[PDB]
Structure 1
Amino acid sequence: DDEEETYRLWKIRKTIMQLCHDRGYLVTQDELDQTLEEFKAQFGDKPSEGRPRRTDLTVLVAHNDDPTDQMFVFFPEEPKVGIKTIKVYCQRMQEENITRALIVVQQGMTPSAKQSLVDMAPKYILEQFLQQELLINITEHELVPEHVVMTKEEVTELLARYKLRENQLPRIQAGDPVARYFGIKRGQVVKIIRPSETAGRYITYRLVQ
């Protein structure tokens, strides 16, 4: 049904914009609390016909601390995504000299596609995201505490204070859903603020392995 996919696309867009605001990219408040009727005004209502087109849903955001650093959020129109379309997106990344990009698939990609994203990850950072994973914001769940990506200076003063090596910290996987949400690679440290029933507040530090 067109209404079901319209609701899906609006919810995916809202989660993407929350993700980009959490990562530090400049996202205006109008786009952050943007509602479903405003999606029916800004975009179409009949995606089978194509009034909301997924190519028309591509998001471009810029970082707050560096306006020359930008992120794409692509929405491929095919269910399974292979080398051809991600090379089209990679050529787009080259021709508008963007560094980071999110690709929101709706069923998945090929294994060779995942291998290729890992291959050009030194140059262009691509992140696979399923539609089903982005249908909600997982960081708003009650089990998920506050994750804050630490700057390298903060990590340096952390390991200086606690006299720690990097391997003596608790770990978090690079494929973790919240690590994928914040888009963090190996060697980054997440400050985790969570309420405590004995202390009130507790801050854990987790290194991305």
Structure 2
Amino acid sequence: ETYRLWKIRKTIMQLCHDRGYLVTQDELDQTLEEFKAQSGDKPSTDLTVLVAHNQMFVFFPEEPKVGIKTIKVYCQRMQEENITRALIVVQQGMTPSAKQSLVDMAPKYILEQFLQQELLINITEHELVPEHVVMTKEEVTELLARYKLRENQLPRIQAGDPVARYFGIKRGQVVKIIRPSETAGRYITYRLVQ
């Protein structure tokens, strides 16, 4: 069962390694035996990560449907620690009034939301999903210039896409996609985000 309360912790510490934080390598890969230290207790929140950039704050609220009050439990410690980004990894989903509470408090703190079974597989290492790479601000200006393209007019990926929501991308950024082929393997495509 614990193949989750571990692989979720395995996934988000693959996730926030891809987003460019400083997770030490031994903290990244755990076998289940390294997580069997806590394995009997948590079925019958003791799981909350703070990592900083080279700072996000994940949450596993044990409530199935996270209400506004459950967000408000750590709205205050969000602004206490002066942390700017957060994650709320939920069990079932948010209550349909609570998702606005994210976008009401939009530009101050970020706090993206994931489901549990959305995160149980690392979609980056899926065979169908190619290697998205977020490009820098100067990597856009050498793109647009070479193709003589305005920022718009690039192929577009949604902001609520599962890989844009993975990599944590606001509007206006451009990902670089390395689609693998058979003759070349380096078929590179870019995508502006919506």
TM-score > 0.5, shorter chain as reference: yes
Per-residue deviation, 1:199: 3.5
Aligned counterparts of 2:60 and 2:42: Cα–Cα separation in 1: 16
Aligned counterparts of 1:202 and 1:144: Cα–Cα separation in 2: 14
Alignment partner of 1:132: what SS? helix
Alignment partner of 2:5: what SS? helix
Task: Determine which of 81, 98, 101 is the counterpart of 1:116.
Answer: 101
Aligned counterparts of 1:207 and 1:124: Cα–Cα separation in 2: 23
- What TM-score results when the alignment is normalised by the length of structure 2? 0.95
Question: Which ranges in structure 2 are unaligned for 5 or more consecutive residues?
Answer: none
**Is contact 1:186–1:208 with CA below 8 Å preserved after alignment?**
yes
Instruction: Check if 1:162 corresponds to 2:176.
Output: no
**Is contact 1:6–1:46 with CA below 8 Å preserved after alignment?**
no
Per-residue deviation, 1:43: 6.0
Aligned counterparts of 1:200 and 1:85: Cα–Cα separation in 2: 46
The CA deviation string for residues 158-204 of structure 1, in whole angstroms up to 9 with x for no partner, is 11221111221000011111111101111011000122234431111
Per-residue deviation, 1:39: 0.7
Aligned counterparts of 1:206 and 1:129: Cα–Cα separation in 2: 23
Aligned counterparts of 1:200 and 1:43: Cα–Cα separation in 2: 42
Runs of 4+ aligned structure 1 residues displaced above 6 Å come to: none
Question: Which ranges in structure 1 are unaligned for 5 or more consecutive residues?
Answer: 49-54, 65-69
Aligned counterparts of 2:142 and 2:186: Cα–Cα separation in 1: 21
Cα root mean square deviation, aligned: 1.3
Q: What's the % identity of the aligned pairs? A: 99
Where is the strand percentage greater, Structure 1 or Structure 2?
1
**Is contact 1:146–1:194 with CA below 8 Å preserved after alignment?**
yes
- What TM-score results when the alignment is normalised by the length of structure 1? 0.89
